[PDB]
Design a protein around this ligand. Sequence first.
Ligand SMILES: [Zn+2]
Lengths: 100, 49, 51, 70, 199
Amino acid sequence: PEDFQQHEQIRRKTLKEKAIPKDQRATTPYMTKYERARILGTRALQISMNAPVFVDLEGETDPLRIAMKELAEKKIPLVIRRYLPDGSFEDWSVEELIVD
Amino acid sequence: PQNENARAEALNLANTDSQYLTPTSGSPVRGLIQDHISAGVWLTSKDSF
Amino acid sequence: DRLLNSSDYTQASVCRECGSILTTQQSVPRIGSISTVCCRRCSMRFEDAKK
Amino acid sequence: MMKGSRRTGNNTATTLNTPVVIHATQLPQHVSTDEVLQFLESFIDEKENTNLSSSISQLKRIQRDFKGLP
Amino acid sequence: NENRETARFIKKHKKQVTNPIDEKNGTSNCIVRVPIALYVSLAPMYLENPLQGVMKQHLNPLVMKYNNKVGGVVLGYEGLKILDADPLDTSEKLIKITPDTPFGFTWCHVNLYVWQPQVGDVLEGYIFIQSASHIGLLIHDAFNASIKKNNIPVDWTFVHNLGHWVDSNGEPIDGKLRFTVRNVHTTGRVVSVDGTLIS
Ligand SMILES: [Zn+2]
C-alpha cells in the first residue's frame, strides 16, 4: 500500500533508464544466428501449446517447420531484447531484421 | 533432446553442416576419406566412357 | 536440457524473506484446513505474543 | 502415499491458478451503497453478454440485497 | 533492543483503514475498494486475445474466496490494466516470455472490491435459524454469522419444540439482528464468522 509505492516507483524508473530508443539504437541490423535459434525455438514452443498460427500450414506436424514457415514471411510476433553488458538494452522486432 | 528450444539448436547451431570448417584456423573437417578418393580418380580419368 | 531439464529438474519452494530452500515446508493442516506452505526461520512460535 | 499425493490438488496452485505476487498498490478506500450497487450493476452487466456461473449468482444475491427483499 | 523490532510485527498484521460507524444504521462500513498488482502467466493460446486470458485464468477464480493478502473476501473486480515491458496507453504492448516455457508473464494493475471484517465492528443481518445455545445469521445475502450462548445473556431462555427464542420480553426474535463481531476463523473453505452481543 505505501512501501510498494516506494518499490514500483524506483523499479520502473530504473527500467525506464536503460532503454535505448529507435533513433539511438546502433547495434547490428542483422539476425545474429542465435536470435534465429531462440526465435525458432520459442515460436515453435508456443505453437505446440495452441498459440495462434499466422500462416497457412498445409500438413505439417512439427512445430519447428511451422515456425520456419512464419519466419519466411516475417509473421513472428516477438521482440528481441538485446542486452548490453552495462545493463542497457535495445528492442528489436522480427519484422525489422533480415533473415540470412 | 527433449524440448523445442533445443531441437532448433541441434538443427541450426551445433549441426554438422555449419561445422564444416574447424574454428581453429578455418580448415575443413568434413570430407570423404579412403574409398571414394582413390575411386574418384578413375571416374574423372579420361578413359571413363 | 542436459543439466537441469533431464537430470534433476526440481521445483522447490523458496521463502522470500529469509532466503532458503530447505526450511520451507508444506503445512500440516487442521483437520478442516488447507495445507499451505510455511517456512521455518521466519516462523516464531505463538508464545512470543507480548503487548 | 494415499494422503500425501492428493495434496497437489488440495492447493492446486500452478501459475495458471494464482498470480505470483499480490501487492496492493494503494490504500483501501470504502465504497458506499450507491457505489457498490452501481458497481454491481455495471460489472455484472459485463459478465453476462464459460465458467464463473456460480459466483455470478452469488453476487446477484448481494445485488438483490441492496434493491429488493429476500 | 527488542522494542523497535516488535514494530516489524505490530505494523505487520494491523490493517490501517477502519470500519467507521456510518449513516447511524448501527452497521459500520465494510465494503472497501483497493487496487492491486498481480503477476500473471498468460497462456500461449490467449496471445491473440490477451485481455481475455488474464481475466479468465487469474481473476474469474479470484472472486468469492477469502484472500490472505488483502485480508478479505474478494467481491468483484473491473478494469484490467496490462503494463508494458517497453517503456515507450496504446494497443500493442509486449510481455516477457520465460526462457524455458512458452508462457510469458507480465504485470497488471486491476481494481478490487472486498469485504472487510475486523474486531470492534457492529453489523446487522438477517437470522436464518437458531437454537438454545447458538443463533446463526446471514449478512448481505452472502455472509454467515453465528451468535452462541457464550455471547448471549442469562435471562434469554428458549421456547422448545423448531423451537423459537425467548428474550427478556418473551418473544421469538425477528430476522434482522444487530450484533458485534468476534474473531473471524477461516478454517473451512466456507468463510466462518464468529460474533458477540454484549458491549
Ligand atoms: Zn530460512
